[PDB]
């Protein structure tokens, strides 16, 4: 019900061009919704924020983690759908902060696709130092490796 409150309330904030809460309460929807139950809403929300994020000269740097959140949600998907966002998105990959978004991904896609764990886990062996991991990121880490379990664990 609270996520519905964020949803209708963000519908009001959307209809008033108070874009702050319009993006925010949607992020509150998707960040818990993706892990718990709603999957296409995850990328649809993080792309709705991501386009107008790329628009404004104020917003297009917040888009990096927004498309990180769009990418690393895997929806029982084994694929490079994150790489579909790579060859979609205006990364400008000589910006290396998106390499902690997608070169992370360019490892772990083929780690999960070649059902391999000592490269997937190694990604966070090195990424925990260069980025502090909060609860949602590690729960999503555990999420994609539950997909790895469903790929491996008999």
């Amino acid at each position: 019900k609270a996520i519905a409150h964020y949803e209708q309330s963000a519908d009001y904030y959307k209809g008033e061009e108070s874009n702050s809460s319009a993006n925010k309460c949607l992020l509150k929807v998707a960040g818990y919704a993706a892990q718990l139950e709603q999957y296409q809403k995850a990328i649809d929300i993080y792309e709705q924020v991501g386009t107008s994020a790329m628009d404004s000269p104020l917003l297009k740097y917040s888009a990096k983690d927004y498309f990180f959140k769009a990418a690393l949600c895997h929806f029982c998907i084994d694929m490079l759908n994150a790489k579909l966002a790579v060859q979609k998105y205006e990364e400008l990959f000589p910006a290396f902060s998106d390499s902690r978004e997608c070169k992370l991904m360019k490892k772990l896609l083929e780690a999960h696709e070649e059902q391999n764990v000592d490269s997937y886990t190694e990604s966070v062996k090195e990424y925990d130092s260069i980025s502090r991991l909060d609860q949602w990121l590690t729960t999503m880490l555990l999420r994609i490796k539950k997909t790895i379990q469903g790929d491996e664990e008999d």
Binding site: Y61, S62, K64, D65, S97, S129, I130, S131, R132
Partner: protein, 49 residues
């Protein structure tokens, strides 16, 4: 001949170790791996806030 010579010889140690401490330079370049990530990690999310 009817000759057996079985012999040994000795080593000349390479340079570049005035004192062991030199490897502390690696402890430096550990630290400039240590003291670099939080700058950007708070920089981009400082831009977020």
């Amino acid at each position: 001949m009817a000759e057996d010579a079985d012999m040994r010889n000795e080593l000349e140690e390479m340079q570049r170790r005035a004192d062991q401490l030199a490897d502390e330079s690696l402890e430096s370049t550990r630290r400039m791996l240590q003291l670099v990530e939080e700058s950007k990690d708070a920089g981009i999310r400082t831009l977020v806030m």
